[PDB]
Amino acid sequence: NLDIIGKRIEKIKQEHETSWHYDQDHPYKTWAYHGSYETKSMVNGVVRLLTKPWDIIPMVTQMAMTKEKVDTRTQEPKEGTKKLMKITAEWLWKELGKKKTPRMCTREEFTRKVRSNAALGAIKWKSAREAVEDSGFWELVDKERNLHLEGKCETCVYNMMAIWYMWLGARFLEFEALGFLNEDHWFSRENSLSGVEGEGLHKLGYILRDVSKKEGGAMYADDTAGWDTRITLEDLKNEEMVTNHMEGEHKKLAEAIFKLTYQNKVVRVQRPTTVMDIISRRDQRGSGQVVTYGLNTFTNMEAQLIRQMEGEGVFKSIQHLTVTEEIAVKNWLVRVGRERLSRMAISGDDCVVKPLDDRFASALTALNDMGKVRKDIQQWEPSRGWNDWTQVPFCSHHFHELIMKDGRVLVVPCRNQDELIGRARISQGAGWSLRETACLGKSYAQMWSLMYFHRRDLRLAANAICSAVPSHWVPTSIHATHEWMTTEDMLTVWNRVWIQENPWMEDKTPVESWEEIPYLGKREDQWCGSLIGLTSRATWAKNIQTAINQVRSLIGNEEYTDYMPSMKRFRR
Ligand SMILES: COC1CN(S(=O)(=O)N2CCCC2)C1
Ligand SMILES: [Cl-]
Ligand SMILES: [Cl-]
Ligand SMILES: [Zn+2]
Ligand SMILES: [Zn+2]
Protein backbone atom coordinates (compact mmCIF):
# COMPACT_ATOMS: atom_id res chain seq x y z
CA ASN A 1 0.00 0.00 0.00
CA LEU A 2 2.12 2.95 1.26
CA ASP A 3 5.13 1.30 -0.43
CA ILE A 4 3.37 1.96 -3.80
CA ILE A 5 1.83 5.39 -2.95
CA GLY A 6 4.31 6.86 -0.40
CA LYS A 7 6.92 8.24 -2.86
CA ARG A 8 4.08 9.99 -4.74
CA ILE A 9 2.75 11.22 -1.32
CA GLU A 10 6.31 12.06 0.04
CA LYS A 11 7.04 14.09 -3.15
CA ILE A 12 3.79 16.21 -3.05
CA LYS A 13 4.26 16.74 0.74
CA GLN A 14 7.59 18.53 0.08
CA GLU A 15 6.71 20.91 -2.80
CA HIS A 16 4.05 22.14 -0.30
CA GLU A 17 5.92 21.54 3.03
CA THR A 18 5.03 25.18 3.96
CA SER A 19 1.33 24.23 4.51
CA TRP A 20 1.22 20.44 5.15
CA HIS A 21 -1.78 20.17 7.55
CA TYR A 22 -3.30 16.78 8.59
CA ASP A 23 -6.84 18.27 8.88
CA GLN A 24 -8.91 16.31 11.47
CA ASP A 25 -12.25 17.51 9.98
CA HIS A 26 -11.70 15.97 6.49
CA PRO A 27 -14.92 14.49 4.96
CA TYR A 28 -13.67 10.92 4.25
CA LYS A 29 -14.48 7.35 5.46
CA THR A 30 -14.16 5.51 2.09
CA TRP A 31 -10.93 7.17 0.75
CA ALA A 32 -7.70 7.04 2.80
CA TYR A 33 -6.89 10.67 3.80
CA HIS A 34 -3.18 11.61 3.80
CA GLY A 35 -2.83 15.42 4.19
CA SER A 36 -3.73 18.93 2.94
CA TYR A 37 -2.02 22.10 1.56
CA GLU A 38 -2.85 25.75 0.58
CA THR A 39 -4.31 26.17 -3.00
CA LYS A 40 -6.22 28.68 -5.25
CA SER A 41 -21.15 27.13 -19.83
CA MET A 42 -21.31 30.02 -22.42
CA VAL A 43 -24.04 30.43 -25.13
CA ASN A 44 -23.22 30.20 -28.87
CA GLY A 45 -24.86 33.38 -30.23
CA VAL A 46 -24.81 32.22 -33.88
CA VAL A 47 -26.96 29.10 -33.06
CA ARG A 48 -29.20 31.02 -30.59
CA LEU A 49 -30.01 33.87 -33.09
CA LEU A 50 -31.05 31.21 -35.70
CA THR A 51 -33.23 29.22 -33.18
CA LYS A 52 -35.43 32.04 -31.74
CA PRO A 53 -38.64 29.95 -31.09
CA TRP A 54 -36.59 27.97 -28.49
CA ASP A 55 -35.79 31.18 -26.50
CA ILE A 56 -39.09 30.53 -24.55
CA ILE A 57 -38.70 26.68 -24.09
CA PRO A 58 -37.31 26.07 -20.53
CA MET A 59 -35.96 22.58 -21.41
CA VAL A 60 -33.65 24.43 -23.94
CA THR A 61 -32.85 27.67 -21.97
CA GLN A 62 -32.25 25.92 -18.57
CA MET A 63 -29.58 23.65 -20.18
CA ALA A 64 -27.22 26.71 -20.50
CA MET A 65 -27.40 27.91 -16.81
CA THR A 66 -25.11 27.29 -13.79
CA LYS A 67 -18.89 13.71 -4.68
CA GLU A 68 -21.52 11.77 -2.59
CA LYS A 69 -21.16 8.92 -5.19
CA VAL A 70 -17.30 8.60 -5.18
CA ASP A 71 -17.10 8.40 -1.30
CA THR A 72 -18.94 4.98 -1.42
CA ARG A 73 -17.43 1.43 -0.93
CA THR A 74 -18.47 -1.63 -3.09
CA GLN A 75 -18.42 -5.05 -1.28
CA GLU A 76 -16.30 -8.13 -2.29
CA PRO A 77 -18.01 -10.58 -4.70
CA LYS A 78 -18.48 -14.17 -3.32
CA GLU A 79 -16.23 -17.17 -4.27
CA GLY A 80 -18.61 -18.33 -7.07
CA THR A 81 -19.01 -14.76 -8.50
CA LYS A 82 -15.13 -14.31 -8.51
CA LYS A 83 -14.67 -17.72 -10.32
CA LEU A 84 -17.39 -16.85 -12.98
CA MET A 85 -15.62 -13.47 -13.63
CA LYS A 86 -12.02 -14.95 -13.79
CA ILE A 87 -13.14 -17.78 -16.18
CA THR A 88 -15.18 -15.33 -18.37
CA ALA A 89 -12.43 -12.62 -18.39
CA GLU A 90 -9.70 -15.17 -19.34
CA TRP A 91 -11.88 -16.44 -22.25
CA LEU A 92 -12.87 -12.88 -23.38
CA TRP A 93 -9.23 -11.55 -23.65
CA LYS A 94 -8.35 -14.75 -25.63
CA GLU A 95 -11.28 -14.11 -28.03
CA LEU A 96 -10.40 -10.36 -28.40
CA GLY A 97 -6.72 -11.30 -28.96
CA LYS A 98 -7.33 -14.00 -31.65
CA LYS A 99 -7.05 -11.49 -34.59
CA LYS A 100 -5.17 -8.62 -32.82
CA THR A 101 -1.56 -8.19 -31.54
CA PRO A 102 -1.02 -6.10 -28.40
CA ARG A 103 1.72 -3.47 -29.09
CA MET A 104 3.17 -0.29 -27.48
CA CYS A 105 1.93 3.10 -28.81
CA THR A 106 4.67 5.69 -29.73
CA ARG A 107 5.82 9.27 -28.82
CA GLU A 108 5.26 9.91 -32.56
CA GLU A 109 1.59 8.74 -32.39
CA PHE A 110 1.01 10.71 -29.14
CA THR A 111 2.55 13.95 -30.51
CA ARG A 112 0.33 13.84 -33.64
CA LYS A 113 -2.82 13.34 -31.50
CA VAL A 114 -1.92 16.52 -29.52
CA ARG A 115 -1.11 18.44 -32.76
CA SER A 116 -4.57 17.33 -33.99
CA ASN A 117 -6.03 18.48 -30.62
CA ALA A 118 -7.82 15.62 -28.77
CA ALA A 119 -9.19 15.20 -25.19
CA LEU A 120 -6.12 13.74 -23.33
CA GLY A 121 -7.39 15.19 -19.98
CA ALA A 122 -3.85 16.51 -19.16
CA ILE A 123 -2.85 19.55 -16.95
CA LYS A 124 6.81 24.79 -17.17
CA TRP A 125 4.74 24.55 -20.45
CA LYS A 126 1.49 26.45 -21.37
CA SER A 127 -0.41 23.86 -23.53
CA ALA A 128 0.20 20.16 -24.30
CA ARG A 129 1.53 20.96 -27.81
CA GLU A 130 4.49 22.95 -26.37
CA ALA A 131 5.53 20.10 -24.02
CA VAL A 132 5.63 17.54 -26.89
CA GLU A 133 8.17 19.92 -28.50
CA ASP A 134 10.41 19.99 -25.36
CA SER A 135 13.00 17.19 -24.91
CA GLY A 136 13.12 17.90 -21.14
CA PHE A 137 9.51 16.66 -20.78
CA TRP A 138 10.57 13.43 -22.54
CA GLU A 139 13.54 13.09 -20.14
CA LEU A 140 10.90 13.35 -17.37
CA VAL A 141 8.83 10.56 -19.04
CA ASP A 142 12.06 8.50 -19.27
CA LYS A 143 12.82 8.87 -15.52
CA GLU A 144 9.16 7.92 -14.80
CA ARG A 145 9.28 4.93 -17.26
CA ASN A 146 12.49 3.31 -15.80
CA LEU A 147 10.83 3.98 -12.38
CA HIS A 148 7.81 1.89 -13.65
CA LEU A 149 10.35 -0.77 -14.87
CA GLU A 150 12.03 -0.24 -11.41
CA GLY A 151 8.44 -1.17 -10.30
CA LYS A 152 7.78 2.20 -8.53
CA CYS A 153 5.90 5.50 -9.29
CA GLU A 154 6.66 9.22 -8.50
CA THR A 155 4.46 11.59 -10.63
CA CYS A 156 1.32 9.59 -11.76
CA VAL A 157 -1.21 11.46 -9.50
CA TYR A 158 -4.91 12.16 -10.32
CA ASN A 159 -6.79 15.54 -10.01
CA MET A 160 -10.60 15.13 -9.40
CA MET A 161 -13.23 17.54 -10.97
CA ALA A 162 -15.97 13.56 -11.10
CA ILE A 163 -13.47 13.44 -14.08
CA TRP A 164 -9.78 13.06 -12.97
CA TYR A 165 -6.90 14.81 -14.90
CA MET A 166 -3.28 13.50 -14.98
CA TRP A 167 -0.36 15.62 -16.37
CA LEU A 168 0.62 14.91 -20.03
CA GLY A 169 3.63 12.74 -19.03
CA ALA A 170 1.55 10.19 -17.05
CA ARG A 171 -1.07 10.25 -19.94
CA PHE A 172 1.77 9.29 -22.35
CA LEU A 173 2.82 6.23 -20.24
CA GLU A 174 -0.87 5.14 -19.93
CA PHE A 175 -1.22 5.56 -23.81
CA GLU A 176 2.11 3.73 -24.51
CA ALA A 177 0.95 0.65 -22.51
CA LEU A 178 -2.83 0.55 -23.33
CA GLY A 179 -3.63 2.87 -26.32
CA PHE A 180 -3.58 -0.19 -28.60
CA LEU A 181 -7.07 -1.13 -27.18
CA ASN A 182 -8.52 2.02 -28.83
CA GLU A 183 -5.88 2.74 -31.58
CA ASP A 184 -6.24 -0.92 -32.99
CA HIS A 185 -10.08 -1.13 -32.50
CA TRP A 186 -10.20 -4.12 -30.05
CA PHE A 187 -13.89 -3.16 -29.34
CA SER A 188 -14.91 -2.86 -33.04
CA ARG A 189 -18.06 -4.92 -33.75
CA GLU A 190 -16.08 -7.12 -36.22
CA ASN A 191 -13.46 -8.00 -33.56
CA SER A 192 -15.75 -8.15 -30.42
CA LEU A 193 -19.24 -9.16 -31.68
CA SER A 194 -20.81 -7.04 -28.82
CA GLY A 195 -18.82 -3.80 -29.25
CA VAL A 196 -19.58 -0.77 -31.46
CA GLU A 197 -16.23 1.21 -31.15
CA GLY A 198 -15.81 3.36 -34.31
CA GLU A 199 -19.34 2.43 -35.55
CA GLY A 200 -21.02 5.89 -35.72
CA LEU A 201 -24.63 7.04 -34.94
CA HIS A 202 -25.73 6.18 -38.53
CA LYS A 203 -24.73 2.51 -37.81
CA LEU A 204 -26.07 1.98 -34.21
CA GLY A 205 -29.71 1.73 -35.39
CA TYR A 206 -28.87 -0.91 -38.03
CA ILE A 207 -26.89 -2.84 -35.39
CA LEU A 208 -29.87 -2.84 -32.90
CA ARG A 209 -32.21 -4.00 -35.75
CA ASP A 210 -29.66 -6.83 -36.53
CA VAL A 211 -29.80 -7.91 -32.82
CA SER A 212 -33.69 -7.70 -33.05
CA LYS A 213 -33.58 -10.37 -35.88
CA LYS A 214 -32.20 -13.06 -33.48
CA GLU A 215 -34.71 -15.48 -31.94
CA GLY A 216 -35.05 -14.68 -28.20
CA GLY A 217 -36.87 -12.66 -25.55
CA ALA A 218 -37.40 -8.92 -25.04
CA MET A 219 -34.54 -6.42 -25.50
CA TYR A 220 -33.06 -5.35 -22.11
CA ALA A 221 -31.24 -2.06 -21.62
CA ASP A 222 -30.61 -1.73 -17.88
CA ASP A 223 -28.37 1.28 -16.98
CA THR A 224 -26.04 0.80 -13.94
CA ALA A 225 -26.17 3.36 -11.08
CA GLY A 226 -22.67 5.06 -11.26
CA TRP A 227 -20.74 2.36 -13.20
CA ASP A 228 -17.23 3.88 -12.55
CA THR A 229 -17.89 3.86 -8.71
CA ARG A 230 -18.95 0.14 -8.78
CA ILE A 231 -15.70 -1.17 -10.41
CA THR A 232 -14.24 -3.67 -7.84
CA LEU A 233 -10.52 -4.50 -7.32
CA GLU A 234 -11.63 -7.97 -8.67
CA ASP A 235 -12.80 -6.21 -11.90
CA LEU A 236 -9.39 -4.28 -12.03
CA LYS A 237 -7.54 -7.69 -11.70
CA ASN A 238 -9.55 -9.37 -14.55
CA GLU A 239 -8.84 -6.29 -16.81
CA GLU A 240 -5.06 -6.67 -15.96
CA MET A 241 -5.15 -10.20 -17.48
CA VAL A 242 -4.77 -8.44 -20.90
CA THR A 243 -1.01 -8.20 -19.88
CA ASN A 244 -0.96 -12.07 -20.19
CA HIS A 245 -1.21 -11.53 -24.03
CA MET A 246 1.83 -9.16 -24.09
CA GLU A 247 5.63 -9.68 -24.09
CA GLY A 248 8.99 -8.16 -23.21
CA GLU A 249 9.03 -4.46 -22.26
CA HIS A 250 5.31 -3.82 -23.11
CA LYS A 251 4.09 -6.52 -20.63
CA LYS A 252 6.16 -4.84 -17.82
CA LEU A 253 5.03 -1.26 -18.73
CA ALA A 254 1.31 -2.41 -18.89
CA GLU A 255 1.72 -4.35 -15.57
CA ALA A 256 3.07 -1.13 -13.94
CA ILE A 257 0.13 1.03 -15.19
CA PHE A 258 -2.37 -1.59 -13.82
CA LYS A 259 -0.47 -2.20 -10.48
CA LEU A 260 0.67 1.40 -9.75
CA THR A 261 -2.01 3.78 -11.24
CA TYR A 262 -5.19 1.52 -11.34
CA GLN A 263 -5.07 -1.11 -8.49
CA ASN A 264 -3.53 1.84 -6.51
CA LYS A 265 -4.48 5.56 -6.98
CA VAL A 266 -3.42 8.95 -5.47
CA VAL A 267 -5.71 11.94 -6.06
CA ARG A 268 -5.64 15.67 -5.30
CA VAL A 269 -9.17 17.12 -4.59
CA GLN A 270 -9.84 20.85 -3.76
CA ARG A 271 -12.01 21.46 -0.61
CA PRO A 272 -13.52 24.95 0.09
CA THR A 273 -12.88 25.01 3.92
CA THR A 274 -9.53 26.25 -0.07
CA VAL A 275 -6.97 23.44 0.69
CA MET A 276 -5.66 20.52 -1.47
CA ASP A 277 -6.51 17.01 -0.08
CA ILE A 278 -4.18 14.08 -1.03
CA ILE A 279 -6.37 10.97 -0.85
CA SER A 280 -5.97 7.37 -2.08
CA ARG A 281 -7.90 4.07 -2.61
CA ARG A 282 -7.61 0.77 -4.58
CA ASP A 283 -10.97 -0.06 -6.35
CA GLN A 284 -13.16 2.18 -8.66
CA ARG A 285 -12.47 3.39 -12.28
CA GLY A 286 -9.59 5.92 -12.49
CA SER A 287 -7.98 6.03 -16.00
CA GLY A 288 -7.86 8.22 -19.15
CA GLN A 289 -11.36 8.68 -20.70
CA VAL A 290 -10.38 6.50 -23.78
CA VAL A 291 -8.81 3.56 -21.82
CA THR A 292 -11.82 3.77 -19.39
CA TYR A 293 -14.17 3.34 -22.42
CA GLY A 294 -12.41 0.13 -23.52
CA LEU A 295 -12.13 -1.44 -20.05
CA ASN A 296 -15.78 -0.43 -19.25
CA THR A 297 -16.82 -2.20 -22.52
CA PHE A 298 -14.74 -5.31 -21.56
CA THR A 299 -16.07 -5.59 -17.95
CA ASN A 300 -19.66 -4.84 -19.19
CA MET A 301 -19.33 -7.59 -21.87
CA GLU A 302 -18.16 -9.93 -19.02
CA ALA A 303 -21.02 -8.99 -16.62
CA GLN A 304 -23.67 -9.40 -19.37
CA LEU A 305 -22.44 -12.90 -20.56
CA ILE A 306 -22.52 -14.02 -16.87
CA ARG A 307 -26.09 -12.58 -16.51
CA GLN A 308 -27.00 -14.55 -19.68
CA MET A 309 -25.38 -17.74 -18.11
CA GLU A 310 -27.58 -17.25 -14.96
CA GLY A 311 -30.74 -16.90 -17.14
CA GLU A 312 -29.84 -20.12 -19.03
CA GLY A 313 -29.19 -21.99 -15.70
CA VAL A 314 -25.46 -22.72 -16.55
CA PHE A 315 -24.84 -22.34 -12.74
CA LYS A 316 -27.22 -22.35 -9.69
CA SER A 317 -25.26 -20.59 -6.87
CA ILE A 318 -23.00 -17.48 -6.85
CA GLN A 319 -21.94 -18.69 -3.35
CA HIS A 320 -19.69 -21.48 -4.68
CA LEU A 321 -19.06 -23.08 -8.09
CA THR A 322 -18.84 -26.89 -8.21
CA VAL A 323 -15.99 -28.49 -10.22
CA THR A 324 -18.47 -29.74 -12.90
CA GLU A 325 -20.08 -26.20 -12.96
CA GLU A 326 -16.64 -24.74 -13.90
CA ILE A 327 -16.40 -27.16 -16.89
CA ALA A 328 -20.02 -26.28 -17.87
CA VAL A 329 -19.33 -22.48 -17.79
CA LYS A 330 -16.21 -23.21 -19.95
CA ASN A 331 -18.21 -25.60 -22.25
CA TRP A 332 -20.89 -22.84 -22.63
CA LEU A 333 -18.32 -20.08 -23.50
CA VAL A 334 -16.55 -22.37 -26.09
CA ARG A 335 -19.86 -23.76 -27.50
CA VAL A 336 -22.01 -20.53 -27.67
CA GLY A 337 -19.90 -17.60 -26.26
CA ARG A 338 -19.55 -15.87 -29.64
CA GLU A 339 -23.27 -16.38 -30.45
CA ARG A 340 -24.17 -14.78 -27.04
CA LEU A 341 -21.77 -11.80 -27.67
CA SER A 342 -23.55 -11.14 -31.00
CA ARG A 343 -26.87 -10.75 -29.01
CA MET A 344 -25.43 -7.58 -27.40
CA ALA A 345 -24.55 -3.99 -28.30
CA ILE A 346 -22.18 -2.59 -25.60
CA SER A 347 -20.69 0.94 -25.49
CA GLY A 348 -18.73 1.29 -22.22
CA ASP A 349 -21.25 1.19 -19.33
CA ASP A 350 -24.18 1.22 -21.86
CA CYS A 351 -25.73 -2.09 -23.10
CA VAL A 352 -28.64 -3.65 -25.01
CA VAL A 353 -29.03 -7.47 -24.65
CA LYS A 354 -31.36 -9.76 -26.58
CA PRO A 355 -31.14 -12.95 -24.47
CA LEU A 356 -32.25 -16.46 -25.47
CA ASP A 357 -35.55 -15.85 -23.50
CA ASP A 358 -37.05 -13.75 -20.65
CA ARG A 359 -35.52 -15.78 -17.72
CA PHE A 360 -32.73 -13.10 -18.03
CA ALA A 361 -35.22 -10.47 -16.60
CA SER A 362 -35.09 -12.09 -13.09
CA ALA A 363 -31.46 -13.41 -13.29
CA LEU A 364 -30.11 -10.80 -10.80
CA THR A 365 -27.87 -12.59 -8.20
CA ALA A 366 -24.53 -12.40 -10.12
CA LEU A 367 -25.28 -8.88 -11.50
CA ASN A 368 -26.14 -7.54 -7.96
CA ASP A 369 -23.16 -9.45 -6.33
CA MET A 370 -20.65 -8.15 -9.02
CA GLY A 371 -21.84 -4.70 -7.70
CA LYS A 372 -23.40 -3.68 -11.12
CA VAL A 373 -26.64 -2.49 -9.36
CA ARG A 374 -29.37 -1.32 -11.82
CA LYS A 375 -30.53 2.36 -11.90
CA ASP A 376 -34.04 3.43 -10.62
CA ILE A 377 -35.51 -0.10 -10.02
CA GLN A 378 -35.58 -2.12 -6.72
CA GLN A 379 -32.61 -4.53 -6.31
CA TRP A 380 -34.72 -7.75 -6.74
CA GLU A 381 -37.47 -6.41 -9.10
CA PRO A 382 -37.24 -8.15 -12.54
CA SER A 383 -36.00 -6.00 -15.50
CA ARG A 384 -38.67 -4.50 -17.84
CA GLY A 385 -37.61 -5.29 -21.44
CA TRP A 386 -38.57 -3.64 -24.74
CA ASN A 387 -40.69 -5.48 -27.32
CA ASP A 388 -39.77 -3.15 -30.24
CA TRP A 389 -36.15 -2.31 -31.29
CA THR A 390 -37.40 1.23 -32.26
CA GLN A 391 -38.14 2.05 -28.53
CA VAL A 392 -34.82 0.73 -27.02
CA PRO A 393 -32.61 3.51 -25.57
CA PHE A 394 -28.88 3.24 -26.55
CA CYS A 395 -26.06 5.93 -26.40
CA SER A 396 -28.73 8.58 -25.51
CA HIS A 397 -30.73 7.82 -28.72
CA HIS A 398 -33.65 5.80 -30.10
CA PHE A 399 -33.87 4.73 -33.75
CA HIS A 400 -36.61 5.09 -36.38
CA GLU A 401 -37.21 3.01 -39.54
CA LEU A 402 -37.82 5.50 -42.39
CA ILE A 403 -38.80 4.44 -45.94
CA MET A 404 -37.59 6.63 -48.82
CA LYS A 405 -40.00 7.49 -51.70
CA ASP A 406 -37.92 4.91 -53.74
CA GLY A 407 -38.54 2.05 -51.17
CA ARG A 408 -34.97 1.98 -49.70
CA VAL A 409 -34.76 1.79 -45.86
CA LEU A 410 -32.96 4.28 -43.56
CA VAL A 411 -32.51 3.44 -39.85
CA VAL A 412 -31.91 6.92 -38.36
CA PRO A 413 -30.83 8.10 -34.90
CA CYS A 414 -33.16 10.39 -32.90
CA ARG A 415 -33.61 12.03 -29.48
CA ASN A 416 -35.83 14.70 -27.90
CA GLN A 417 -35.23 17.81 -30.08
CA ASP A 418 -34.99 20.09 -27.02
CA GLU A 419 -31.82 18.15 -26.03
CA LEU A 420 -30.35 18.62 -29.57
CA ILE A 421 -31.10 22.37 -29.74
CA GLY A 422 -30.01 23.01 -26.11
CA ARG A 423 -26.57 21.32 -26.69
CA ALA A 424 -25.87 23.24 -29.99
CA ARG A 425 -26.54 26.52 -28.07
CA ILE A 426 -23.64 25.84 -25.67
CA SER A 427 -19.89 26.44 -26.20
CA GLN A 428 -17.25 25.03 -23.74
CA GLY A 429 -14.52 27.46 -22.50
CA ALA A 430 -14.10 31.11 -23.59
CA GLY A 431 -11.69 33.40 -25.54
CA TRP A 432 -13.83 32.51 -28.63
CA SER A 433 -13.77 34.90 -31.61
CA LEU A 434 -17.00 35.49 -33.63
CA ARG A 435 -15.40 33.33 -36.40
CA GLU A 436 -14.63 30.35 -34.06
CA THR A 437 -18.21 30.61 -32.56
CA ALA A 438 -19.63 30.58 -36.18
CA CYS A 439 -17.47 27.49 -37.10
CA LEU A 440 -18.81 25.58 -34.02
CA GLY A 441 -22.38 26.48 -35.04
CA LYS A 442 -21.54 25.17 -38.53
CA SER A 443 -20.25 21.88 -36.96
CA TYR A 444 -23.68 21.39 -35.20
CA ALA A 445 -25.56 22.38 -38.38
CA GLN A 446 -23.59 19.81 -40.49
CA MET A 447 -24.21 17.08 -37.84
CA TRP A 448 -28.00 17.78 -37.99
CA SER A 449 -27.97 17.64 -41.83
CA LEU A 450 -26.30 14.18 -41.82
CA MET A 451 -27.80 12.48 -38.72
CA TYR A 452 -31.07 14.38 -37.90
CA PHE A 453 -32.18 15.38 -41.52
CA HIS A 454 -35.52 13.63 -40.81
CA ARG A 455 -36.48 16.28 -38.12
CA ARG A 456 -38.20 19.20 -39.97
CA ASP A 457 -36.94 21.90 -37.49
CA LEU A 458 -33.28 20.67 -37.56
CA ARG A 459 -33.08 20.42 -41.41
CA LEU A 460 -34.41 24.04 -41.59
CA ALA A 461 -32.16 25.35 -38.79
CA ALA A 462 -29.08 23.54 -40.30
CA ASN A 463 -29.77 25.10 -43.75
CA ALA A 464 -30.19 28.50 -42.03
CA ILE A 465 -26.91 28.20 -40.03
CA CYS A 466 -24.93 26.97 -43.15
CA SER A 467 -26.48 29.97 -45.05
CA ALA A 468 -25.47 32.43 -42.24
CA VAL A 469 -21.82 31.26 -41.89
CA PRO A 470 -19.29 31.96 -44.71
CA SER A 471 -19.39 29.02 -47.20
CA HIS A 472 -15.63 28.19 -47.03
CA TRP A 473 -15.26 28.58 -43.22
CA VAL A 474 -14.17 25.23 -41.70
CA PRO A 475 -16.23 23.58 -38.91
CA THR A 476 -14.30 23.22 -35.58
CA SER A 477 -14.52 21.29 -32.25
CA ILE A 478 -15.69 6.84 -28.95
CA HIS A 479 -18.44 4.86 -30.84
CA ALA A 480 -18.49 7.76 -33.34
CA THR A 481 -17.07 8.93 -36.69
CA HIS A 482 -17.36 12.72 -37.34
CA GLU A 483 -18.25 12.80 -41.09
CA TRP A 484 -19.81 16.29 -40.64
CA MET A 485 -16.32 17.73 -39.88
CA THR A 486 -15.56 18.72 -43.56
CA THR A 487 -16.03 21.58 -46.14
CA GLU A 488 -17.31 19.03 -48.73
CA ASP A 489 -20.93 19.55 -49.90
CA MET A 490 -23.35 17.92 -47.35
CA LEU A 491 -25.49 16.15 -50.02
CA THR A 492 -22.25 14.40 -51.26
CA VAL A 493 -21.33 13.32 -47.67
CA TRP A 494 -25.01 12.19 -47.12
CA ASN A 495 -24.70 9.96 -50.29
CA ARG A 496 -21.36 8.47 -49.12
CA VAL A 497 -22.60 7.75 -45.50
CA TRP A 498 -26.22 6.59 -46.10
CA ILE A 499 -25.89 4.93 -49.59
CA GLN A 500 -22.35 4.21 -50.87
CA GLU A 501 -20.68 3.00 -47.60
CA ASN A 502 -23.93 1.65 -45.95
CA PRO A 503 -23.73 -2.18 -45.85
CA TRP A 504 -27.51 -2.49 -45.20
CA MET A 505 -28.35 -0.69 -48.59
CA GLU A 506 -28.11 -3.08 -51.63
CA ASP A 507 -29.17 -0.44 -54.28
CA LYS A 508 -26.32 2.16 -54.61
CA THR A 509 -28.28 4.71 -56.75
CA PRO A 510 -27.14 8.17 -55.52
CA VAL A 511 -29.72 10.70 -54.26
CA GLU A 512 -29.76 13.76 -56.62
CA SER A 513 -31.37 16.36 -54.24
CA TRP A 514 -32.32 16.94 -50.59
CA GLU A 515 -36.05 16.60 -51.51
CA GLU A 516 -35.49 12.82 -52.24
CA ILE A 517 -34.48 12.58 -48.52
CA PRO A 518 -37.47 11.87 -46.26
CA TYR A 519 -38.72 13.16 -42.87
CA LEU A 520 -40.38 11.24 -39.97
CA GLY A 521 -44.22 11.40 -39.77
CA LYS A 522 -45.64 14.87 -38.88
CA ARG A 523 -47.08 13.41 -35.60
CA GLU A 524 -43.89 11.31 -34.89
CA ASP A 525 -41.88 14.59 -35.34
CA GLN A 526 -44.06 16.43 -32.71
CA TRP A 527 -43.81 13.38 -30.34
CA CYS A 528 -39.95 13.68 -30.54
CA GLY A 529 -40.03 17.43 -29.73
CA SER A 530 -40.82 19.30 -33.02
CA LEU A 531 -42.47 22.78 -32.82
CA ILE A 532 -44.29 22.21 -36.20
CA GLY A 533 -47.91 23.42 -35.84
CA LEU A 534 -46.94 26.32 -33.50
CA THR A 535 -47.32 29.99 -34.46
CA SER A 536 -43.78 30.89 -33.18
CA ARG A 537 -42.31 28.14 -35.48
CA ALA A 538 -44.44 29.25 -38.52
CA THR A 539 -43.15 32.88 -38.17
CA TRP A 540 -39.57 31.63 -37.73
CA ALA A 541 -39.69 29.49 -40.96
CA LYS A 542 -41.60 32.15 -43.00
CA ASN A 543 -39.09 34.93 -41.99
CA ILE A 544 -35.89 32.77 -41.89
CA GLN A 545 -34.01 34.95 -44.53
CA THR A 546 -34.30 37.91 -42.06
CA ALA A 547 -32.60 35.87 -39.25
CA ILE A 548 -29.94 34.64 -41.73
CA ASN A 549 -29.32 38.34 -42.73
CA GLN A 550 -29.04 39.47 -39.04
CA VAL A 551 -26.19 36.98 -38.44
CA ARG A 552 -24.55 37.80 -41.87
CA SER A 553 -24.58 41.53 -40.89
CA LEU A 554 -22.83 40.72 -37.55
CA ILE A 555 -20.10 38.52 -39.18
CA GLY A 556 -19.68 41.12 -42.02
CA ASN A 557 -18.96 41.24 -45.78
CA GLU A 558 -17.97 37.60 -46.51
CA GLU A 559 -18.86 35.01 -49.21
CA TYR A 560 -22.21 33.25 -48.31
CA THR A 561 -24.32 30.53 -50.05
CA ASP A 562 -28.17 30.43 -49.72
CA TYR A 563 -28.98 26.76 -48.83
CA MET A 564 -32.72 27.49 -48.13
CA PRO A 565 -33.95 26.69 -51.77
CA SER A 566 -32.70 23.07 -51.16
CA MET A 567 -36.10 22.85 -49.29
CA LYS A 568 -39.30 22.64 -51.45
CA ARG A 569 -41.12 25.59 -49.69
CA PHE A 570 -38.18 28.10 -50.17
CA ARG A 571 -38.19 27.62 -53.98
CA ARG A 572 -39.19 30.83 -55.87
C1 LIG B 1 -48.87 16.97 -36.89
O1 LIG B 1 -49.34 18.26 -37.27
C2 LIG B 1 -48.54 18.91 -38.26
C3 LIG B 1 -48.48 20.42 -37.99
N1 LIG B 1 -48.78 20.52 -39.44
S1 LIG B 1 -48.43 21.58 -40.60
O2 LIG B 1 -49.11 21.16 -41.78
O3 LIG B 1 -48.63 22.88 -40.07
N2 LIG B 1 -46.86 21.41 -40.90
C4 LIG B 1 -46.24 20.12 -41.23
C5 LIG B 1 -45.06 20.53 -42.09
C6 LIG B 1 -44.66 21.87 -41.51
C7 LIG B 1 -45.98 22.55 -41.25
C8 LIG B 1 -49.51 19.23 -39.41
CL1 LIG C 1 -41.77 -1.75 -26.37
CL1 LIG D 1 -20.10 18.69 -32.77
ZN1 LIG E 1 4.11 6.63 -12.41
ZN1 LIG F 1 -37.54 10.06 -32.35
From TrEMBL:
CTP binds at residues 226-228, 296, 375. It comes from the Viruses. It is found in: Host endoplasmic reticulum membrane; Host mitochondrion; Host nucleus; Secreted. Mg(2+) 1 binds at residues 223-224, 349. Zn(2+) 1 binds at residues 144, 148, 153, 156. Zn(2+) 2 binds at residues 398, 400, 414, 528. Mg(2+) 2 binds at residues 223, 350. Residues 217-363 form the RdRp catalytic domain. Regulates the ATPase activity of the NS3 helicase activity. NS4A allows NS3 helicase to conserve energy during unwinding. Plays a role in the inhibition of the host innate immune response. Interacts with host MAVS and thereby prevents the interaction between RIGI and MAVS. In turn, IFN-beta production is impaired. Interacts with host AUP1 which mediates induction of lipophagy in host cells and facilitates production of virus progeny particles. Required cofactor for the serine protease function of NS3. May have membrane-destabilizing activity and form viroporins. Homodimer; in the endoplasmic reticulum and Golgi. Interacts with protein prM. Interacts with non-structural protein 1. This is Genome polyprotein.
